Design an enzyme around this catalytic site. Sequence first.
Site, PDB file in Angstrom:
ATOM      1  N   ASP A   1       0.829  -1.195   0.000  1.00 19.71           N
ATOM      2  CA  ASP A   1       0.000   0.000   0.000  1.00 19.71           C
ATOM      3  C   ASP A   1       0.867   1.250   0.000  1.00 19.71           C
ATOM      4  O   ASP A   1       1.848   1.342   0.739  1.00 19.71           O
ATOM      5  CB  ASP A   1      -0.915   0.010   1.222  1.00 19.71           C
ATOM      6  CG  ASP A   1      -1.977  -1.062   1.164  1.00 19.71           C
ATOM      7  OD1 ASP A   1      -2.386  -1.442   0.047  1.00 19.71           O
ATOM      8  OD2 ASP A   1      -2.411  -1.519   2.242  1.00 19.71           O
TER       9      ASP A   1
ATOM     10  N   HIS B   1      -0.951   4.649  -0.534  1.00 15.85           N
ATOM     11  CA  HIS B   1      -1.932   5.530   0.110  1.00 15.85           C
ATOM     12  C   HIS B   1      -1.552   7.006  -0.004  1.00 15.85           C
ATOM     13  O   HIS B   1      -1.638   7.764   0.964  1.00 15.85           O
ATOM     14  CB  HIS B   1      -2.156   5.135   1.572  1.00 15.85           C
ATOM     15  CG  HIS B   1      -3.251   4.132   1.766  1.00 15.85           C
ATOM     16  ND1 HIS B   1      -3.003   2.806   2.048  1.00 15.85           N
ATOM     17  CD2 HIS B   1      -4.597   4.261   1.722  1.00 15.85           C
ATOM     18  CE1 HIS B   1      -4.150   2.161   2.169  1.00 15.85           C
ATOM     19  NE2 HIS B   1      -5.133   3.022   1.977  1.00 15.85           N
TER      20      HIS B   1
ATOM     21  N   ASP C   1      -4.484   0.367  -3.431  1.00 17.37           N
ATOM     22  CA  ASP C   1      -4.674   1.297  -2.313  1.00 17.37           C
ATOM     23  C   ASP C   1      -3.569   2.358  -2.281  1.00 17.37           C
ATOM     24  O   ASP C   1      -2.778   2.454  -1.341  1.00 17.37           O
ATOM     25  CB  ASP C   1      -4.755   0.555  -0.974  1.00 17.37           C
ATOM     26  CG  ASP C   1      -6.177   0.289  -0.538  1.00 17.37           C
ATOM     27  OD1 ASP C   1      -7.087   0.383  -1.384  1.00 17.37           O
ATOM     28  OD2 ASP C   1      -6.385  -0.017   0.656  1.00 17.37           O
TER      29      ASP C   1
ATOM     30  N   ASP D   1      -5.890   7.225  -1.169  1.00 16.18           N
ATOM     31  CA  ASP D   1      -6.511   7.953  -0.073  1.00 16.18           C
ATOM     32  C   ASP D   1      -5.557   8.037   1.106  1.00 16.18           C
ATOM     33  O   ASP D   1      -4.513   7.381   1.131  1.00 16.18           O
ATOM     34  CB  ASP D   1      -7.819   7.288   0.372  1.00 16.18           C
ATOM     35  CG  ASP D   1      -8.914   7.402  -0.665  1.00 16.18           C
ATOM     36  OD1 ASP D   1      -8.906   8.388  -1.428  1.00 16.18           O
ATOM     37  OD2 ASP D   1      -9.785   6.508  -0.716  1.00 16.18           O
ATOM     38  N   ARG D   2      -5.952   8.850   2.089  1.00 13.36           N
ATOM     39  CA  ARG D   2      -5.226   9.047   3.347  1.00 13.36           C
ATOM     40  C   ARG D   2      -3.787   9.500   3.094  1.00 13.36           C
ATOM     41  O   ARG D   2      -2.818   8.891   3.553  1.00 13.36           O
ATOM     42  CB  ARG D   2      -5.270   7.785   4.216  1.00 13.36           C
ATOM     43  CG  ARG D   2      -6.649   7.156   4.324  1.00 13.36           C
ATOM     44  CD  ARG D   2      -7.527   7.907   5.333  1.00 13.36           C
ATOM     45  NE  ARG D   2      -7.154   7.790   6.745  1.00 13.36           N
ATOM     46  CZ  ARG D   2      -6.906   6.674   7.427  1.00 13.36           C
ATOM     47  NH1 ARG D   2      -7.163   5.472   6.932  1.00 13.36           N
ATOM     48  NH2 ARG D   2      -6.440   6.769   8.669  1.00 13.36           N
TER      49      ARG D   2
ATOM     50  N   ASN E   1      -9.302  -1.539  -2.276  1.00 14.43           N
ATOM     51  CA  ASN E   1     -10.672  -1.179  -1.928  1.00 14.43           C
ATOM     52  C   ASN E   1     -10.879   0.327  -1.897  1.00 14.43           C
ATOM     53  O   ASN E   1     -11.995   0.801  -2.134  1.00 14.43           O
ATOM     54  CB  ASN E   1     -11.088  -1.809  -0.597  1.00 14.43           C
ATOM     55  CG  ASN E   1     -10.272  -1.323   0.598  1.00 14.43           C
ATOM     56  OD1 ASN E   1      -9.435  -0.426   0.511  1.00 14.43           O
ATOM     57  ND2 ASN E   1     -10.605  -1.864   1.756  1.00 14.43           N
ATOM     58  N   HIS E   2      -9.827   1.090  -1.595  1.00 15.24           N
ATOM     59  CA  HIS E   2      -9.923   2.543  -1.606  1.00 15.24           C
ATOM     60  C   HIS E   2     -10.117   3.103  -3.002  1.00 15.24           C
ATOM     61  O   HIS E   2     -10.456   4.283  -3.137  1.00 15.24           O
ATOM     62  CB  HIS E   2      -8.678   3.168  -0.983  1.00 15.24           C
ATOM     63  CG  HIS E   2      -8.712   3.220   0.511  1.00 15.24           C
ATOM     64  ND1 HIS E   2      -9.253   4.279   1.204  1.00 15.24           N
ATOM     65  CD2 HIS E   2      -8.270   2.346   1.444  1.00 15.24           C
ATOM     66  CE1 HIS E   2      -9.146   4.055   2.501  1.00 15.24           C
ATOM     67  NE2 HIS E   2      -8.552   2.888   2.673  1.00 15.24           N
TER      68      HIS E   2
ATOM     69  N   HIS F   1      -4.965  -7.687  -3.078  1.00 16.49           N
ATOM     70  CA  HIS F   1      -5.008  -6.602  -2.105  1.00 16.49           C
ATOM     71  C   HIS F   1      -5.477  -7.097  -0.746  1.00 16.49           C
ATOM     72  O   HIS F   1      -4.747  -7.012   0.248  1.00 16.49           O
ATOM     73  CB  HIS F   1      -5.917  -5.481  -2.595  1.00 16.49           C
ATOM     74  CG  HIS F   1      -6.153  -4.420  -1.569  1.00 16.49           C
ATOM     75  ND1 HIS F   1      -5.125  -3.781  -0.912  1.00 16.49           N
ATOM     76  CD2 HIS F   1      -7.299  -3.906  -1.063  1.00 16.49           C
ATOM     77  CE1 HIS F   1      -5.626  -2.908  -0.059  1.00 16.49           C
ATOM     78  NE2 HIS F   1      -6.944  -2.960  -0.133  1.00 16.49           N
TER      79      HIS F   1
ATOM     80  N   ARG G   1     -15.037  -4.304   9.714  1.00 17.40           N
ATOM     81  CA  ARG G   1     -14.850  -3.247   8.737  1.00 17.40           C
ATOM     82  C   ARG G   1     -16.128  -2.862   8.012  1.00 17.40           C
ATOM     83  O   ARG G   1     -16.118  -1.872   7.273  1.00 17.40           O
ATOM     84  CB  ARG G   1     -13.799  -3.660   7.698  1.00 17.40           C
ATOM     85  CG  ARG G   1     -12.390  -3.193   8.007  1.00 17.40           C
ATOM     86  CD  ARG G   1     -11.455  -3.539   6.862  1.00 17.40           C
ATOM     87  NE  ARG G   1     -10.111  -3.011   7.055  1.00 17.40           N
ATOM     88  CZ  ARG G   1      -9.047  -3.753   7.329  1.00 17.40           C
ATOM     89  NH1 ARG G   1      -9.134  -5.068   7.447  1.00 17.40           N
ATOM     90  NH2 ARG G   1      -7.867  -3.163   7.484  1.00 17.40           N
TER      91      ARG G   1
ATOM     92  N   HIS H   1      -3.005  -5.053   3.396  1.00 21.23           N
ATOM     93  CA  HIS H   1      -4.237  -4.431   3.858  1.00 21.23           C
ATOM     94  C   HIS H   1      -4.194  -3.879   5.277  1.00 21.23           C
ATOM     95  O   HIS H   1      -5.076  -3.088   5.620  1.00 21.23           O
ATOM     96  CB  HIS H   1      -5.398  -5.426   3.733  1.00 21.23           C
ATOM     97  CG  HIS H   1      -6.739  -4.774   3.673  1.00 21.23           C
ATOM     98  ND1 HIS H   1      -7.013  -3.735   2.813  1.00 21.23           N
ATOM     99  CD2 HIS H   1      -7.884  -5.015   4.354  1.00 21.23           C
ATOM    100  CE1 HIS H   1      -8.266  -3.356   2.974  1.00 21.23           C
ATOM    101  NE2 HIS H   1      -8.818  -4.117   3.901  1.00 21.23           N
TER     102      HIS H   1
END
Lengths: 293, 398, 70, 56
Positions: A56, A58, A84, A87-88, A116-117, A166, A213, A240
């Site tokens: 990841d 991110h 992923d 995001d973040r 998934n993001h 992922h 989740r 993940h």
Amino acid sequence: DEKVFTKELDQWIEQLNECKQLSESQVKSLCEKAKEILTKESNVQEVRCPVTVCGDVHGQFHDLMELFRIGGKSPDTNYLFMGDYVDRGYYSVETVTLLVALKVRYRERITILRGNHESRQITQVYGFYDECLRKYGNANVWKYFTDLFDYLPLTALVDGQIFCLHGGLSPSIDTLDHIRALDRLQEVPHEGPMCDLLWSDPDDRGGWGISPRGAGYTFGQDISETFNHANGLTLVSRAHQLVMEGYNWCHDRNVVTIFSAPNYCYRCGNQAAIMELDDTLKYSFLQFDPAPR
Amino acid sequence: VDDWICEEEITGTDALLRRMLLTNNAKNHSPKQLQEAFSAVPVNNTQVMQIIEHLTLLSASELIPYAEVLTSNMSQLLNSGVPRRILQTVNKLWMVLNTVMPRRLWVMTVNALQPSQQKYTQNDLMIDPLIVLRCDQRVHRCPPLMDITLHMLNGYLLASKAYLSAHLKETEQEVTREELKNALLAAQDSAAVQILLEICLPTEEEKNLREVQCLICCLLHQMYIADPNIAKLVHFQGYPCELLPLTVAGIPSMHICLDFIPELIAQPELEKQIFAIQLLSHLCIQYALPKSLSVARLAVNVMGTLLTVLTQAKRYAFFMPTLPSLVSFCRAFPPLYEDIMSLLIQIGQVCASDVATQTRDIDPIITRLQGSMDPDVQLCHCIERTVIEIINMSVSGI
Amino acid sequence: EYTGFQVALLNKDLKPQTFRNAYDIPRRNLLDHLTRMRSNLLKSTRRFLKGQDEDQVHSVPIAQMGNYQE
Amino acid sequence: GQTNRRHTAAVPGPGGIWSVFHAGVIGRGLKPPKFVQSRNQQEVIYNTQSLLSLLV
Ligand SMILES: [Mn+2]
Ligand SMILES: [Mn+2]
């Protein structure tokens, strides 16, 4: 036509590496060529050895640049990213643009999976939509990047023996032929095989369970052992969860968590790591710190 | 002790008599004379044989200056066509020089027997002694050079023991470090044993070997009587079964190998159990003792118990390599016959039942008259062939 | 070896300690591991480890490890 | 249709008094060289013809 697009895309790589955002028409053309290059790619893309699998990102662009300073430059060492990367993080559009431009430049050297993001709702709620409005100005580039996330392949296979994805396994998936039979050309649902593919996670359990989740499941050593035995695999690589040491060998040397975003959300202080499968499937771990700022 | 015991008086001071009556004028020979005798562009083995045969009679202290030319010219002594006295007499001169200048001789011999370049020192050889086993390919079928290599390897293994002890003792500024050093030494000796045993394999290009095999057997016997823990560790690790005759017939110390076959057969790992069964069978062929018969009965009971507890694929993987060991057990001891026979008939019919479980491409059930096949019919064929071997052993066994 | 023998079964919670004991090293990587062992005894570092791979057990929390720092 | 000798002979350079480069082997190594199946269609079609003739 090939020469001018190749040199323009190389200049795009060079302008991205110095952390400058592109224009809307350039992103249009990049996304269109990305759509064309990702249409002809299966759900389980066979990636031949050698390959350096990364986890990841991110949206931590300077950490991505450090990652390229550790594992090697993108022309020379093969990469496999398990999604992923959107995001973040403060610099999100630069990261995804660099990955997609590297994919359409080097089609056998960069393999990009789906996280998934990388869906419309999650990018809308966790930051990519806001980053889209603050840099480029309107929400249209978010539309191209969501379609681009829509076409991305789900999983990957390394020498028929390592399965890279992922999230985790699925109660509805038993064979890898079912992964290749899924309709990938859709946004990730709340229930189903592919949401579990991009959302599940291992835990020290004895069976399936509801993941904490809101989507996906959780699986134990028995399930992973059954999946590895029934499919001729020996390793399941995934990215993940946040890990301090950057790598985890859970489910008794069968499931490998590889997180490649050091100092996740700039406040956790984790030392990330990536895996480097040589030509002999004869691996090593590159473990690194966050970049100076 | 070998180096000091080759110095002792042999029979009647015959060597003194030779150095009294044959080396009256040997001052004409020189190290550089041997140097261009070796380095002639044709291979004139006669003059180098002259010089080395005269070099036999000299004392070791007088043979010190020829170490340079001998060691530097070991590498030429590997081509197809060298006469045998050259190799044997260079071995004898190396043994003479080993009695006086051993450490410099070994560190000089490493740098010469290496394949064709890295110059190696004593510290690297004491840290790692396995470069001695990283010599040229042609050394593996040259018996004198392998004898030199084996003495050198034993010396450097003891050297590495002393070096690790000293480096551990100096760098204190403690039980965990000591056991870590013990584990390193044990794995080191086991690795040396395994590399030697893999030298003992026949190479794939041929598919002089016996000389290398018996020399390696001598070195392994010395290392096993030095400490049995290395023998136990190696037999726990395992080596290919084609070495199982050679290792048992040639190393007497494998008799104490009958001490841990109950322990080796009790390990959860399965291939360790096949190795234990096969090793026990070859030992019972070699040494027929009440201890061997008792562990043989234990082996039969273990095979029966594993017949009770085994999955079909694991049953094939376990019972395919074992069954010749049952021939060995039956050949060694008559009183086990019916017990052996019972196991066979049981395994036979259970495999027969498995043949009835699914369709087969050969249908062996109706073949009561006499490649890549089904594993079950292969297991049935192995059972019937091992019964044939037992019966023909019994008929011709007098 | 007489009426008191039981063949041991494989234990999942075994934790095979490859540096504490020479018995736990398989053959097919043995020389590899041997070199690694030598490196440990020649590293002379501040911390000496008895395991090649000690990743984690079940959970990797940010708060638990972030408390052990200034 | 449908070791150790060769290991230690080639371990120079990256070893020495320093640790080896890798961390282990994922499985048993490369997964074979993969087999390529080869048939001829005339034998296939005519064995099929023989079997369907027997069935009919
Ligand atoms: Mn992400
Ligand atoms: Mn994720």
